[PDB]
Amino acid sequence: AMQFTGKNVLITGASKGIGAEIAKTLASMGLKVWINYRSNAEVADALKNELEEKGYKAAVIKFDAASESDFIEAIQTIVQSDGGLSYLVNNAGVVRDKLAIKMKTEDFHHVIDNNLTSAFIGCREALKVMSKSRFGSVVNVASIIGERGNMGQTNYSASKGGMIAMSKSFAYEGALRNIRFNSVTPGFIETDYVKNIPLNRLGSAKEVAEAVAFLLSDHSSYITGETLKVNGGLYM
Amino acid sequence: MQFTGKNVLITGASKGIGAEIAKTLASMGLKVWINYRSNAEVADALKNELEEKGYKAAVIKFDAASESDFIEAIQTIVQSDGGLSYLVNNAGVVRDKLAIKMKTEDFHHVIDNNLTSAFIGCREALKVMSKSRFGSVVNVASMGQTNYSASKGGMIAMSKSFAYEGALRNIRFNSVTPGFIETVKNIPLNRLGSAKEVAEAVAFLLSDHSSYITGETLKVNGGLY
Amino acid sequence: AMQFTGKNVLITGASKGIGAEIAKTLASMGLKVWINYRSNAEVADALKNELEEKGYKAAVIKFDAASESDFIEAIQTIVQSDGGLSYLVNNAGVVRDKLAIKMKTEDFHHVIDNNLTSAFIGCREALKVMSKSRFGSVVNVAGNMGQTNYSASKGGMIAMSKSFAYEGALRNIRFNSVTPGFIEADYVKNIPLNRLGSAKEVAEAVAFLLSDHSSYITGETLKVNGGLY
Amino acid sequence: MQFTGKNVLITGASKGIGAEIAKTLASMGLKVWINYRSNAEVADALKNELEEKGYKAAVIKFDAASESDFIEAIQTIVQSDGGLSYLVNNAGVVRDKLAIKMKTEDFHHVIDNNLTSAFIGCREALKVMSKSRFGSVVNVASIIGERGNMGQTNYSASKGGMIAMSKSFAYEGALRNIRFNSVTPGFIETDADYVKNIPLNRLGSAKEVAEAVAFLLSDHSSYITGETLKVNGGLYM
Ligand code: NA
């Protein structure tokens, strides 16, 4: 177990895939995890249950990370239960791949609001809530697409490129008060194209999850404004 | 510089950097289309200035953030000129504030005006330049700047994705990232850049001289980054 | 304690500063540390002793990392004592800042040989020795006014490490880099975190990149500079 | 393109990319100095070709890896032309090997020929251009230097080093308006398994690289220093 001065963590879009592993990983290292879900209570509750059965601390929380007012409410709820919030992971993300010539503005906004605006709101709240205690760490989960572009993903790459850039700006603003901001850019993660990956396999959600954890942990305390690639050598 | 193409649309071309891009490109033989959003007088004075020097220039009102306006404007150009070879996404605003003071509206305002606008422009470029299997497109960039850095980081990333999508049809996409441009201690060249210095880098990236260059970001900042 | 599938680690220039902390940190997480020194046996022995007195596993080993033949001999020695080598840290490094117009070729080579060539040799040997067992991780510890030679050697190291990452990838030998900033107030003013880093903070990022935790990470550079770049 | 400066030295200018840089720059009115190491005939044939078209050109023998040879050669140019406004460090060799097969001598061979050579050139450019408070210098590197490569631990090292080093030079020349920049070519026509990963779906010409070098030297890029310009057809973004 990595070392955490903080006690709890909010993970957006934590119901499944990468968000679910981040919750597992961080729970296994002694943090109380808050598992944000948007729609399905049963999946999120089953995850919470699974973690409790292993002796870890976990809770579920319903909101839409793209909604300003839902995100503010959800933080107020956490501060009320736990006394504060030390850690945050902006993971909420959707895709809507189309060739640009076919893509409508609505398709572009849809991904921008759900991926970038959501991270802006989360990061803003983190700064509000973590400044009081002069301690925090935030990780934005982004993608290789945000660094290198992709055919059919003008909107995804825009939202991830934006997230990466934005996170650095936050890093500047949280720095004096020891609130760190960093990004992670997964490559191809399980859940053909393996040939272009030097490690010659897909990454697990776990491998991403453990890099997020490092960046939240005290081990990375002189690290802020960095992007950590977790892509098997696909992009260097 | 050499241009296979014949004309260019520049968004936010009334003044500052956009205006210099128009001058520069007009003096190198391209017919420039000068998009303005609000002030007709400044745009028409620019058009006039360029005409009086024997260059070819036109003016066009539309809001680059508006999908339907951008599509109409291109239709207008295609109708006058037969097509469009070059495009410069320059439309851009700032609204600096510390993130804790910043409202969602402040964030969207910059996103829609800077990033969404470049998306639309790029999309239309692709539609209109594919037919003729030729084009070049330049996306111009612009503590307290979470919204600006988001929109510009996004633009840079998005442009690369466009570069992928235009590549087979020889439609290049590239970015320029100006530093402090005239409207110093941390700038190695120890001076502000002129709008002209930005404008000539745009021109290179549109010119045939940069024909093996796509998906790139060109910094024009005096060594500041 | 972070998770290590591997058992031992060689650290070049481990006598003092950052190299010494990498040794302490990794020793405390259960790895047998090999403490390379070039000249002073006493300081290196005192470190080894300190770590053994705490119940950790540690050894010292004399060689010049810039020397091809010395480095090969030393690895042979390790393989022979421990059965193999799972981890390596190229930390051997010098500076010789001067303005380029005053800098001689000898000044440039001096830094290149001691920083870049040394890392090449270490990385090459890592690949030879780790390929048999299809497991390993390697960390290279890496512009500016007055530092044409340093930036050259560090830019090179960073680029070279990626090439290594390609070559070790099929055999699950990962290569990564770390780029410390100012490590222990007018220097501090340009650092967003507004303080110097400790050797520990660098040492723990190295450890992560060696640990199983970073197993899908290769060819990456990890900045440990407090937001300075 | 517009050049305030009047002449240019290009290292390894006999052939390939270096030759095209010379042709390009000659056709835009610069007096070009064509460095060669070994073969006089090829360099002379290039000079001849350019003179027959009414351009200004000279040949100059030296090894860019040798400090003393490079100093002499600049002294020669200053003596003929009054100064030197532009420089292109292009001298470069390859010696690909898998690292486990590579000897230290193989590593140095590329470092000395590619990186040390650029360091010397850049150093001299600074000495010779400072007096007149004007200059531009381009280090021709490679995509390999940005992304690394299987079998090119020594090439990448030397190009990664170049790109980093050039920025340091940019800092040191900035007050005196001496700009330093790099170019990183991708796969350039070498005399369809390479081509499939290139979005533009073709190899670049030596010309397309040559014209990017020219831009970076030209007055058109006067607010650009410490930058790396990729000329790789989208292969790396
Ligand atoms: Na061309």
Chain CA centroid to CA B2, Å = 19
From CA C153, how far away is CA C161, in angstroms rounded? 12
Shortest CA distance to D169 belongs to which of D130, D219, D124, D122?
A: D122
- Is the Cβ of A195 closer than 8 Å to some Cβ of chain C? no
Residue with tokens 């140019």: D77
Instruction: Please report, as a single letter, which amino acid is at residue D121.
Output: G
- Is the Cβ of D147 closer than 8 Å to some Cβ of chain A? yes
Instruction: Kindly report the backbone phi and psi dihedral angles of residue D21, in degrees, each rounded to the nearest multiple of 5, phi listed first.
Output: -55, -45
Torsion of Cα atoms, A23 then A28 then A32 then A38, to 10°? 20
* A222:C225 CB<8 A: yes
State the DSSP code for C197. Answer: B
Chain C residues 26-85 within an 8 A CB cutoff of chain A: none
The shares of helix, strand and coil residues in chain D, as percent rounded to the nearest 5, are 50, 15, 35
Give the DSSP letter string of chain A. ----SS-EEEETT-SSHHHHHHHHHHHHTTPEEEEEESS-HHHHHHHHHHHHHTT--EEEEE--TT-HHHHHHHHHHHHHHHS---EEEE---------GGG--HHHHHHHIIIIIIHHHHHHHHHHHHHHTTT-EEEEEE--HHHHH--TT-HHHHHHHHHHHHHHHHHHHHHTTTTEEEEEEEE-SB---GGGG-TT-SPBPHHHHHHHHHHHHSGGGTT--S-EEEESTTS--
Shortest CA distance to D156 belongs to which of D95, D203, D213, D100?
A: D95
User: How many Cα atoms within 13 Å fall on the side-chain side of residue B20?
Assistant: 17
From CA D160, how far away is CA C146, in angstroms rounded? 18
Calculate how close chain C gets to D160, using CA atoms only, in Å.
Answer: 5
From CA C91, how far away is CA D33, in angstroms rounded? 42
From CA D123, how far away is CA D68, in angstroms rounded? 12
From CA C33, how far away is CA C60, in angstroms rounded? 8
**Which CA distances in Å does D139 have to A223, C98, D8, D58, D226?**
32, 21, 13, 21, 11
User: How many Cα atoms within 13 Å fall on the side-chain side of residue B46?
Assistant: 31
Distance B208 CA to ligand 1 centre (A): 4
Burial classification of residue C57, based on how many CB atoms lie within 10 Å of its CB (0-12 exposed, 13-18 middle, 19 or more buried): middle
Shortest CA distance to C210 belongs to which of C141, C160, C153?
A: C141
From CA B32, how far away is CA D39, in angstroms rounded? 49
Chain CA centroid to CA A69, Å = 19
User: How many Cα atoms within 13 Å fall on the side-chain side of residue B164?
Assistant: 19
Instruction: Please report, as a single letter, which amino acid is at residue B94.
Output: V
**Which CA distances in Å does B155 have to B69, B148, B152?**
20, 10, 5
For an interface test with A, which of C139, C188, C217, C223 has the most A Cβ atoms less than 10 Å from its Cβ? C217
The radius of gyration of chain A's CA atoms, rounded to the nearest angstrom, is: 17
By the 8 A CB rule, do B209 and B1 touch?
A: yes
Shortest CA distance to B190 belongs to which of D43, C66, D206, D178?
A: D178
Instruction: Please report, as a single letter, which amino acid is at residue A90.
Output: N
The radius of gyration of chain C's CA atoms, rounded to the nearest angstrom, is: 17
Instruction: Please report, as a single letter, which amino acid is at residue D3.
Output: F
From CA D143, how far away is CA D188, in angstroms rounded? 11
State the DSSP code for D111. Answer: I
The radius of gyration of chain B's CA atoms, rounded to the nearest angstrom, is: 17
- Is the Cβ of D148 closer than 8 Å to some Cβ of chain A? yes
**CA-based torsion, D78, D80, D85, D90: positive or negative:** negative
Burial classification of residue B153, based on how many CB atoms lie within 10 Å of its CB (0-12 exposed, 13-18 middle, 19 or more buried): buried
- Cβ contacts of C48 within 8 Å, gap of 6 or more: C35, C58, C59, C60
User: Which among B168, B215, B220 has CB closest to D224?
Assistant: B220
The SS3 assignment for D99 reads helix
From CA B159, how far away is CA B161, in angstroms rounded? 5
State the DSSP code for C102. Answer: G
* A199:C227 CB<8 A: no
Residue with tokens 């990466």: A164
From CA C176, how far away is CA C221, in angstroms rounded? 6
Distance D232 CA to ligand 1 centre (A): 13
Calculate how close chain D gets to C59, using CA atoms only, in Å.
Answer: 26
- Is the Cβ of A236 closer than 8 Å to some Cβ of chain D? yes
Chain CA centroid to CA D220, Å = 19
By the 8 A CB rule, do D128 and D75 touch?
A: no
For an interface test with D, which of C110, C118, C164, C166 has the most D Cβ atoms less than 10 Å from its Cβ? C166
Burial classification of residue D164, based on how many CB atoms lie within 10 Å of its CB (0-12 exposed, 13-18 middle, 19 or more buried): buried
The SS3 assignment for D135 reads strand
From CA D126, how far away is CA C102, in angstroms rounded? 11
- Is the Cβ of A195 closer than 8 Å to some Cβ of chain D? no
- Is the Cβ of A226 closer than 8 Å to some Cβ of chain C? yes
By the 8 A CB rule, do D126 and C81 touch?
A: no
* A165:B149 CB<8 A: yes
By the 8 A CB rule, do D92 and D21 touch?
A: no
Calculate how close chain C gets to A180, using CA atoms only, in Å.
Answer: 9
From CA C225, how far away is CA A222, in angstroms rounded? 6
State the DSSP code for B192. Answer: P
By the 8 A CB rule, do B59 and B43 touch?
A: yes
By the 8 A CB rule, do A63 and A36 touch?
A: yes
By the 8 A CB rule, do B122 and B173 touch?
A: yes
- Cβ contacts of D106 within 8 Å, gap of 6 or more: D95, D97, D154
- Is the Cβ of A134 closer than 8 Å to some Cβ of chain C? no
User: Which among A109, A161, A169 has CB closest to B158?
Assistant: A161
- Is the Cβ of B167 closer than 8 Å to some Cβ of chain D? yes
Distance B212 CA to ligand 1 centre (A): 7
Chain D contact partners (≥3 CB pairs within 8 A)? A, B, C
User: Which among C99, C117, C219 has CB closest to D148?
Assistant: C219
For an interface test with D, which of B213, B217, B224 has the most D Cβ atoms less than 10 Å from its Cβ? B213
Solved using: X-ray
From CA C84, how far away is CA B187, in angstroms rounded? 51
Parallel/antiparallel/unpaired status of strands A136-141 and C173-180: unpaired
Length of chain D: 237
By the 8 A CB rule, do A107 and A28 touch?
A: no
Give the DSSP letter string of D208-234. HHHHHHHHHHSGGGTT--S-EEEESTT
* B212:D233 CB<8 A: yes
User: Tokens standing for D83?
Assistant: 């100064």
D-chain residues within 8 Å CB-CB of C157?
157, 160
Output b/e per residue, A162-185; b: 16+ Cβ within 10 A.
Answer: bbbbbbbbbbbbbbeebbbbbbbb
From CA D137, how far away is CA A105, in angstroms rounded? 44
Q: Which residues are paired to A89 by β-bridges?
A: A11, A139
For an interface test with A, which of B123, B161, B168, B217 has the most A Cβ atoms less than 10 Å from its Cβ? B161
Burial classification of residue D196, based on how many CB atoms lie within 10 Å of its CB (0-12 exposed, 13-18 middle, 19 or more buried): exposed
Length of chain C: 229
Instruction: Please report, as a single letter, which amino acid is at residue B202.
Output: V
Calculate how close chain D gets to C127, using CA atoms only, in Å.
Answer: 7
B-chain residues within 8 Å CB-CB of D1?
1, 209
User: Which among C148, C159, C165 has CB closest to D159?
Assistant: C159
D-chain residues within 8 Å CB-CB of A236?
147-148
User: Which among D174, D200, D229 has CB closest to B218?
Assistant: D229
Residue with tokens 């997480």: C29
Shortest CA distance to A17 belongs to which of A151, A186, A147?
A: A186
Distance D230 CA to ligand 1 centre (A): 15
- Is the Cβ of C97 closer than 8 Å to some Cβ of chain D? no
Q: What residues of B are designated binding site for NADP(+)?
A: 90, 148-152, 181
Query: Rounded to 5 degrees, what angle do the CA atoms B132, B134, B136 make?
Result: 140
Q: Which domains does chain B have, with CATH numbers?
A: 1-225 (3.40.50.720)
Distance D20 CA to ligand 1 centre (A): 13
A-chain residues within 8 Å CB-CB of D148?
236
Instruction: Please report, as a single letter, which amino acid is at residue C157.
Output: M
